[PDB]
Amino acid sequence: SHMKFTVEREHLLKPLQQVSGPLGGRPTLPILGNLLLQVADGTLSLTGTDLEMEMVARVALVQPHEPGATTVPARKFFDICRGLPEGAEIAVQLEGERMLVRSGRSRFSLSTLPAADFPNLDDWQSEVEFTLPQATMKRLIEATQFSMAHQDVRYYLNGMLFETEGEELRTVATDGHRLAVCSMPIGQSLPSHSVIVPRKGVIELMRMLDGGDNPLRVQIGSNNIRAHVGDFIFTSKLVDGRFPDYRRVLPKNPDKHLEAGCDLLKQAFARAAILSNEKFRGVRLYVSENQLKITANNPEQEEAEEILDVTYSGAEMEIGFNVSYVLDVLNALKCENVRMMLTDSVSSVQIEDAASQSAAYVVMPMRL
Amino acid sequence: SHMKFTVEREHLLKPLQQVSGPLGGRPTLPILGNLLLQVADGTLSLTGTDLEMEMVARVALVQPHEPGATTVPARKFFDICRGLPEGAEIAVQLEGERMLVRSGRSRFSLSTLPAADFPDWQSEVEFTLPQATMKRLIEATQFSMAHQDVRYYLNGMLFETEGEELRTVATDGHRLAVCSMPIGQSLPSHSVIVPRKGVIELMRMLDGGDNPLRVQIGSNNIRAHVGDFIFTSKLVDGRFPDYRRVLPKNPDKHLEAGCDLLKQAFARAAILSNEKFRGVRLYVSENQLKITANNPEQEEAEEILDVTYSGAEMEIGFNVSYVLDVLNALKCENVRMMLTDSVSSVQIEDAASQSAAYVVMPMRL
Amino acid sequence: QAXLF
Amino acid sequence: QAXLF
Ligand SMILES: [Cl-]
Ligand SMILES: [Cl-]
Ligand SMILES: [K+]
């Protein structure tokens, strides 16, 4: 009840922003809208949770301090510190059930809830551990995030598969119509392990990465995943389910390969999409010798047609696709040329960067 | 119809974007989602409207063309032209009830509605002024306009001519903003109310370029010419309150303070104000301002500022959002506040300029 | 909140 | 739309 600390604003701002950002989603449970503050030894720990995931930040206390703990409204405390001027010294002390914040001639009195009432952390043990650059995790998530299901009745699809095996880390996401897979080497021999990170967890893991030189350290348990970057520790529950065996649906023997410029292909699909059915978004692809024709029609009987020069020397074919699924892939590919691998008009197509096998995308066609 | 024209992509984009402004997602009448296209002589005219206001753009046709007119879906046609590559030549021609757009090896067939189905007034007052002056007049007062107030005449902006000045006024009954600018022309005394969206639309057509703006005010409409764009809006048929009556008559209490320090102090105190009523308190005494705020959880904020004040001590409450709106609109170094008592309005303005003035009504302590 | 009228 | 399974 006698916690005291003084911290410079810029050493407190990012911790508060990171731990407080995800909070406020459980309005019937007031204490989950608060941050747990703990002063012990020379460290201030800041914890916020929604019971599904948790964010912890450590702040070094260089100025005199006194041990203690409390909980305070997260966003208000963040807004106060961010509203103070650059360079401000933020003196905090507990006085009964009020937390007092002083800086210059700005004084604030916040309401508290006892630290003893804060949900005590999930106790779990790590089963797999590895380190990798932040940029590599950045790439793995961006390459597949868009293919995750949104509010699918199949809860096990509303997340991202994280797969470790040998020297490879792999992410997979699918909604049953389209699939994205991305693999990166990490340089450690790892045991074979597959876990599903919930959608919200993926986003939060995404947003704590600053690309900087700090490495990322991942610990995977049986029911939780943890990411440690610098002075931040993020923990999330795993989705307790089984991801589909995606290897079975990867096109087995695509004998027809098409290559085209990524941008020209994307700008052509994007124009044709304008006159596609606004709900079903169907477009038609006609592939012939070194030529791709894209058409679109809508209930108003309006029509678009695009003809592109491509590299294709296979059987003539027609195949329908949801143009949004196609455009999402081309937007996710940040490359010069793309390769499309086809089988027939009723089978999926595999799309990739022509110059890299790192990421692959499988899109199921439409019956147009 | 015989309408034909071929125009370079970048000559159509800004016209299409401007004429699309008055259109909103999902109109009530299908033709209101279309743009009217008219080819006559060497000009392509594009018009879009929501029946309350209308935007017209003229485009010179140097390439071969044939006269005619039709209407086409605004969003689809703009998206097609903007989706084509930079430098694209856009060929348009009609085939029955469809409008065809060709460029490179891109073909588009759009549905049309007859131009005859596409939706006259006299000018009473006219004047010209720089685009930047109209922009400032609107920016200085727009935020004080009412939003869907049952008093419909407040859901807009007063445009007032008097002597040689053009003046805008906006209020929602709780706060008021007025801005006056000289325009170098002898004007008749006149007053009209422009609806919110017309103000916004007029605001967006100004690019602060070297082209002057030409304004025509009728009895029931206002029109603005900028370059090759013509914007017309109906006026709000109502009586605007006499704003001269609300300027504090004889404010004996004057306060001056740094705008930014004052702004940041109110912003921090607002954090612990009631989330619905946003009330804060000002305690003004000799060269000191104290700002306090509390909320139903009994949390409290206090900010103390050095100011220049010599009037009688007093306490007064305000909606901090109204105060912050004024300080954000004032893009200046120091602010002057003019007070009377705890239950009377306050006048706020830049200490170095009376061009704009802001009047905020206090809250019950 | 008080009104200006 | 066809499904992957
Ligand atoms: Cl510090
Ligand atoms: Cl042209
Ligand atoms: K809840």
CA dist list (Å): A183 to A141, A159, A202, A337: 10, 17, 16, 19
Largest interatomic CA distance in chain B: 79
First to last CA, chain D: 12
Ligand nearest to the Cα of A52, by number: 3
Beta bridge partners of A193: A164
**Interchain CB distance below 8 Å, B111 and A302:** yes
Measured distance CA(B106)–CA(B9) in Å, rounded = 13
**Closest C-alpha to B344, from B248, B206, B227:** B248
Chain-centroid distance, C-alpha B168: 11
If phi > 0 it is left, if psi is from -120 to 50 it is alpha, else beta; for residue B193 that is beta
Q: At what angle do helices B320-329 and B259-270 cross, to 10 degrees?
A: 150
Say how far apart CA B176 and CA B344 lie, in whole Å. 14
Q: Is B94 helix (H, G, I), strand (E, B) or coil?
A: strand
Place domain B4-117 in its CATH homologous superfamily: DNA Polymerase III, subunit A, domain 2 (3.10.150.10)
CA distance B241 to B256: 29
Query: What are the helix (H) ranges across A248-303?
Result: 262-273
Query: What SS3 class is residue A71?
Result: strand
The Cα B287–Cα B291 span in angstroms is 14
H or E segment at B140?
A: none
**A157 in reach of chain D (CB within 8 A):** no
* Encoded tokens for A300: 């108003």
SS3 (DSSP) at B197: helix
Judge whether B230 and B223 are in contact, CB under 8 Å: yes
Is the separation of the CB atoms in A70 and A88 below 8 Å?
no
Q: How far apart are CA A281 and CA B143, in angstroms?
A: 40
Per the DSSP assignment, residues forming a β-bridge with B161 are B166, B190
- Cα B208 to Cα B138, B198, B226: the distances in Å are 13, 18, 10
Q: How many CB atoms sit inside 10 A of residue A90's CB?
A: 22
- Residue B120 makes CB contacts below 8 A (sequence gap 6+) with none
- 3-state SS assignment for residue B95: strand
- Alpha-carbon distance of A10 to A89, in angstroms, equals 9
| B225 contacts chain C (CB < 8 A) | no
Measured between alpha carbons, how far is A325 from A332 in angstroms, rounded to an integer? 11
Chains D and A touch (3+ CB pairs under 8 A): yes
Contact B225, B213 (CB under 8 A): yes
Question: C-alpha angle B49/B51/B54, rounded to 5°?
Answer: 35
Which letter does DSSP use for residue A201 in this model?
A: H
The alpha-carbon gap from D5 to the nearest alpha carbon of chain A, in Å, equals: 7
Q: Which residues contact B186 (CB under 8 A, 6 or more apart)?
A: B163, B164
The answer to whether residues A332 and A358 touch, using CB atoms and an 8 Å cutoff, is no
What are the CA-CA distances from residue A247 to residues A147, A179, A225, A252, B296 (Å)? 16, 11, 24, 9, 57
How near does any CA of chain C get to the CA of B241, in Å? 9
Q: Give phi and psi for A156, each to the nearest 5.
A: -70, -10
Q: Does residue A244 sit at the D interface (CB-CB below 8 Å)?
A: yes
Residues in the 5 Å CB sphere of ion ligand 2: B 7-8, 11
Gap from B94 CA to chain C (nearest CA, Å): 57
> Could you give the CA distance from residue A34 to residue A72 in angstroms, rounded to a whole number?
5
The partner residues of A34 in beta bridges, in order of sequence, read A73
Cross-chain Cβ contact D1/A348 below 8 Å = no
C-beta atoms of C4 and B277 within 8 A: no
Technique used to solve these coordinates? X-ray
Picking from C1, C4, C5, the nearest residue to B319 by CB comes out as C1
> In terms of Cα–Cα distance, which of A235, A204, A240 is closest to A124?
A235
A123 residue type, one letter? D
Task: Enumerate residues 6+ apart whose C-beta is below 8 A from B150.
Answer: none
Q: What is the resolution of this structure in A?
A: 2.0
- The helix-helix angle for B74-83 and A262-273 (nearest 10°) equals 170
Nearest residue of A to residue D1 by CA position?
Answer: A366
Handedness of CA A81, A82, A84, A86 (dihedral sign): positive
Whether B34 and B47 have beta carbons less than 8 Å apart is answered as: no
User: What are the strands, taking DSSP E only, across A199-326?
Assistant: 215-220, 224-229, 232-237, 256-261, 282-288, 291-297, 303-309, 317-322
| A78-to-A75, A180, A306, B90 alpha-carbon distances in Å | 5, 37, 52, 53
The minimum CA-CA distance between B300 and chain A, rounded to whole Å, is 5
Distance CA B1, CA A355 (A): 51
How many beta carbons lie within 10 A of that of residue B79, not counting itself?
18
Cβ atoms within 10 Å, residue A305? 21
Nearest to B83 among A110, A111, A271 (CB): A271
Cα(B38)–Cα(B2) distance, integer angstroms: 11
Any residues with CB less than 8 A from the CB of B188 and at least 6 apart, and which? B125, B161
CA-to-CA separations, B317 to A219, A256, A294, A296, B296, in angstroms, rounded: 53, 74, 64, 61, 16
Summary count for chain A: helices (H), strands (E): 6, 22
Among A268, A323, A330, A322, residue whose Cα is nearest residue A293: A268
Distance in angstroms (rounded) separating the CA atoms of residues A12 and A58: 10
Q: What is the Cα–Cα distance from B138 to B178, expressed in whole angstroms?
A: 10
Chain breaks in chain B (C to N over 2.5 A) after: 119
- Tell me the chain C residues in contact with residue B241 when contact means C-beta distances shorter than 8 Å: 4-5
Helix (H, G, I), strand (E, B) or coil at B2: coil
Tokens 């053009």 locate to B166
User: What is the rounded CA–CA span in Å between residue A241 and residue A195?
Assistant: 9
Judge: B241–C4 Cβ closer than 8 Å, yes or no: yes
The two three-digit tokens of residue A40, written as one number: 């012990």
Give the class (CATH, top level) of A5-117: alpha beta
Beta carbons within 8 Å of B283's beta carbon, 6+ residues apart: B289, B290, B291, B292, B313, B314, B315
The pairing of beta strand B308-309 with beta strand B43-49:
unpaired
Measured distance CA(B25)–CA(B32) in Å, rounded = 10
Please list every residue in chain D whose beta carbon sits closer than 8 Å to the beta carbon of residue A348.
Answer: 4
